[PDB]
């Protein structure tokens, strides 16, 4: 399924994912597309800060949901 990850400027990063993909895996996909190291990425959905070891399904993320990406220096 596709999900969207919005950056601070409103850019959409579209990812192809499965419900059993982890947040670690999502950050790896973002690194591959955008070149941003996973350790610099913070993902948020429905007000929750998303933990690397949990899955999309653990957060009830569904097709075409919009996550937010916030970045940190390092
Ligand atoms: Mg896969």
Author numbering: 1 to 74
Give verbatim lines from the article:
Recently, Ub phosphorylation at S65 has come to light as a novel and important component in the PINK1 (PTEN-induced novel kinase protein 1)-Parkin pathway. In its native conformation, parkin is autoinhibited, and phosphorylation of both parkin and Ub by PINK1 at a conserved S65 appears to be necessary for complete activation of parkin’s E3 ligase activity.
With the flexible C-terminal tail included, the UbS65D and UbWT structures superimpose with a backbone RMSD of 0.56 Å for chain A of the two-chain asymmetric unit and 0.94 Å for chain B. Removing the flexible-tail residues R74, G75, and G76 decreases RMSD to 0.50 Å for chain A, and 0.69 Å for chain B. The backbone structures of UbS65D and UbWT are very similar, even in the loop containing S65. Elsewhere in the molecule, the greatest structural deviation is in the C-terminal tail, which is likely a result of the tail’s flexibility, as well as in the β1/β2 loop comprising residues T7 to G10.
